[PDB]
Amino acid sequence: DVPLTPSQFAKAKSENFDKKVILSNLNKPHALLWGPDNQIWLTERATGKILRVNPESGSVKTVFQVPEIVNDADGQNGLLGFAFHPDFKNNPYIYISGTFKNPKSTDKELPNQTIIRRYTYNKSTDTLEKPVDLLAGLPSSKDHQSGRLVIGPDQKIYYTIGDQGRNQLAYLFLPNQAQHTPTQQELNGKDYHTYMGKVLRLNLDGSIPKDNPSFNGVVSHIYTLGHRNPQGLAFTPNGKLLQSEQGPNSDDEINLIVKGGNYGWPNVAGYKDDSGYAYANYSAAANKSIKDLAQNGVKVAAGVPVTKESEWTGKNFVPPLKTLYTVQDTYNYNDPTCGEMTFICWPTVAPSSAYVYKGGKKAITGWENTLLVPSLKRGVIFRIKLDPTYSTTYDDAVPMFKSNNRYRDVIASPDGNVLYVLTDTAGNVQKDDGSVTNTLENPGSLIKFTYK
Amino acid sequence: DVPLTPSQFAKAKSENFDKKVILSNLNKPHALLWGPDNQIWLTERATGKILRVNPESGSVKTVFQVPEIVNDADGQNGLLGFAFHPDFKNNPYIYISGTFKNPKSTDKELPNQTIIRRYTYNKSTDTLEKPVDLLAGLPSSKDHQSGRLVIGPDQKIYYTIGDQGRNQLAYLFLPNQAQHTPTQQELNGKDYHTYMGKVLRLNLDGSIPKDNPSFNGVVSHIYTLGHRNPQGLAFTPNGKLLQSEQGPNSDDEINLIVKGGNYGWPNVAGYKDDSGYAYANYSAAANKSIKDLAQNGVKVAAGVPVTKESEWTGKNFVPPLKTLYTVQDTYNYNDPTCGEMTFICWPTVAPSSAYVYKGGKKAITGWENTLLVPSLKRGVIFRIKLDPTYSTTYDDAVPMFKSNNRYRDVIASPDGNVLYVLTDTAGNVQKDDGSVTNTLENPGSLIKFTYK
Ligand SMILES: O=C(O)c1cc(C(=O)O)c(-c2[nH]c(C(=O)O)cc2C(=O)O)c(C(=O)O)n1
Ligand SMILES: O=C(O)c1cc(C(=O)O)c(-c2[nH]c(C(=O)O)cc2C(=O)O)c(C(=O)O)n1
Ligand SMILES: [Ca+2]
Ligand SMILES: [Ca+2]
Ligand SMILES: [Ca+2]
Ligand SMILES: [Ca+2]
Ligand SMILES: [Ca+2]
Ligand SMILES: [Ca+2]
Ligand SMILES: [Li+]
């Protein structure tokens, strides 16, 4: 899709909702869920705290704090995945993922691992207990961790793990592994270094499902590959799997996740269109003093090999359902017509989640079969219509709740007339007038939007 | 997708198949079917003849000639739709569509109608009898008739009817009706003038299914709208409906047809990307001597209103699964480096059909879940892979059987190792080196390709 203008974002004020801020100054709140007790549960990525919030009064209790979570002030690591067992009455389990020290790391630049872990909720002591590591030794870095964790209708764990930031900024010269898959030998050794830029599908005990797809002749935890930073993952009522993902300077994506698919990253951003992106592989550059021009591979410094999207020899490439956004090759990523901070003008929205709106007794008129996608950079939440079979999007991503906030997650109440939203404590966001600000209106908040 | 080069087309010679011409004396052969008698049936568009060919021996019979079919030498009208009832043993019906004079027409420039008609097959005399007009008074013209007629798993007729060529060449100043829909009053008077650029869904007696979708508050025969020239229509084994469609100078499409969808034409060609096309509405030009520069609306003469794809206010817009092909706004539709007939290099392939490959006990390796799309202009048959649920394409359109032929239709034998194709009698086609020729290697032929 084509980017909206600053004026088109500014008018998306959602006057048909009442806003109430329930909490602010949470410490990097990240995921929120409607709990089995019809209370709101949310995580703090930086602290490992799991908080429960009463919808009526807003009273908050720190139910548990995941010990030994590692978080860097400038990093996207910490406490990440968070899900309840779907049959919680009979299976009172909470599933998380988190950044933890890796004691066998022999790489001081990458000292941590990601672990997917199960906890048991004890209703009598009202806390979590009896941890069990389901899958450890996963990649960890400060960038593009993703870490969305959901339980599918098949009672498998689906877990997004980002490309760790390879081929940009602090990890510019590390080779991106989004396209790579393990050998049988690596699997035998539990060497999961290729579990970067993937959707994983795990048995509830952490083992490899025997019906997982095969990649390069090996069945592993990998379900799909070729992802950058897929922070959104949600099943539809008819069992399909929708997803949002952050692109580079362009081509954030809404994807339909299909078993064994290849979503193209880093060789293809968005559609395979050779439009506004090319794959510049800095790990293959002649030397590591070369500079990233940050023009999305359309123009690069001498010495870095570039591969057009159309030159990639790919298998099972699956294009996005929608891009937010795609631009022409002649697009100016340094466009001087906004300020010294051109990145705010890049044709992206930085989607942070993806939530399937299920309606209810007070369903919002017209919202049938929609996907809600919060935007960090634009300070909106998108509403994206699909057809009733969730086979295609209809029309465009409709912005809502415009504010100077970085929207991080969103759910709806069971009745469907109330939305609950998390915002980041810090970062940049685009103002009504299109310029950037790092003054956020509601830092680290839980916000309630009630349909009038 | 990005266009293949002339080199890339010329290399698609399919040396793994043996070619044999079965018939070479056909006049504008149009549709090809594997019949319920395990014979090949095919149509001649201008004569109205229905032929049956023994696939083993090659003997042929003219089973029937549809009387009073109207065809213009410079036109795409004539005998079009052709399908068997799916339970032919117990319901020996054949359904056709055709161009016929319209005795009610008061327009000497549009004197004809399209009629969807049923015939009863008499196996004792081997001919068609008892004609019955199921739906009459449909639009007719020389351009963009489409006319694919299939019967779905719901035992409804699905029928493609093109946009009649409005807003180009001889019909430049007629307002395109692809987006328009009937009022209830128009349905009462059987005024089907808005049945242009549609997929229709009809009951087997021609009536309106009671569960057809609503458009602008009215349920009609329309199932989907917003099409230009959709000549390919085919159901998958799991009940999904795939389609191919010719775009203007760009953006031929493979579409997934979903109930109630809007496929965007003429406001959107291909994706809603504002890339290489814009909607120049010559009917809205105040001056009717204005010229169409034929640069796909990117460059226009003074006086014609132009709407960008992103400026359209649309409802239920469904993007294509794949475009053949999409180019940048900087694309040159007049590239003199291509030869004096610059249209031959345009980023299109002119798909003429769409066929779901079902395999069999001699299925061609790697062709699971493929869609075969014949190309008129490039003289190839494309193979397009989808995932096993037919929810997404995988990778690109792979060209096959390159020759100096205009491929019009394609089917496969039950065992899956033989493909049968029809070729046009006349027209232009791209040669190995990219230039244009109107010398076709196999004019008006039924050809088979056998895997060896
Ligand atoms: O303008 C863009 O394209 C853009 C903007 C941002 C932004 O939020 O400022 C991000 C981003 N997302 C996170 C996150 O925690 O999800 C952290 C950052 C960051 O740059 O610090 C990304 C991206 O990561 O692709 N792209
Ligand atoms: O190069 C292109 O884009 C292109 C090329 C052709 C071509 O075949 O030469 C056609 C076309 N298709 C039919 C048909 O019978 O289906 C007739 C014609 C015609 O131009 O006479 C179209 C189009 O109709 O869009 N576009
Ligand atoms: Ca980005
Ligand atoms: Ca992708
Ligand atoms: Ca792209
Ligand atoms: Ca065309
Ligand atoms: Ca279309
Ligand atoms: Ca387009
Ligand atoms: Li005839």
Author numbering:
A (entry chain B), B (entry chain A): 1 to 452
Manuscript excerpt for this entry:
However, this dimeric enzyme, composed of two identical 453 amino acid monomers (pI = 8.75), also presents drawbacks in terms of broad substrate specificity and loss of activity over time. Briefly, all crystal structures contained a tight dimer of sGDH in the asymmetric unit, the dimeric interface extending over 1110 Å2 being maintained by the presence of two calcium ions as described in Oubrie et al. interacting with the N262-D273 loop, referred to as the 4CD loop in the nomenclature of Oubrie et al.. 2Fobs-Fcalc electron density maps from the wild-type and both mutant structures all showed a different molecule instead of the PQQ-cofactor, corresponding to a PQQ modified cofactor, with the bond between C4 and C5 missing.
We report the characterization of two sGDH mutants: the single mutant Y343F and the double mutant D143E/Y343F. N428T and D143E mutations significantly reduced selectivity for lactose and maltose, with a cumulative effect for the double mutation D143E/N428T. For example, at physiological concentrations (5 mM), the Y343F and the D143E/Y343F mutants have a glucose oxidation steady-state catalytic rate constant (kss) 1.5 and 7.1 times increased compared with that of maltose, respectively. At pH 7.5, the addition of catalase slows down the aging of the enzyme. By consuming the H2O2 once it is produced, catalase indirectly maintains the integrity of the cofactor and compared with the enzyme without catalase, increases the retention of enzymatic activity of sGDH for at least 8 h. Numerous attempts to co-crystallize mutant protein with glucose and maltose substrates all failed to locate the sugar substrates in the resolved structures (data not shown). Indeed, as can be seen in Figure 4, the rotation of the pyrrole ring obscures the glucose binding site observed by Oubrie.
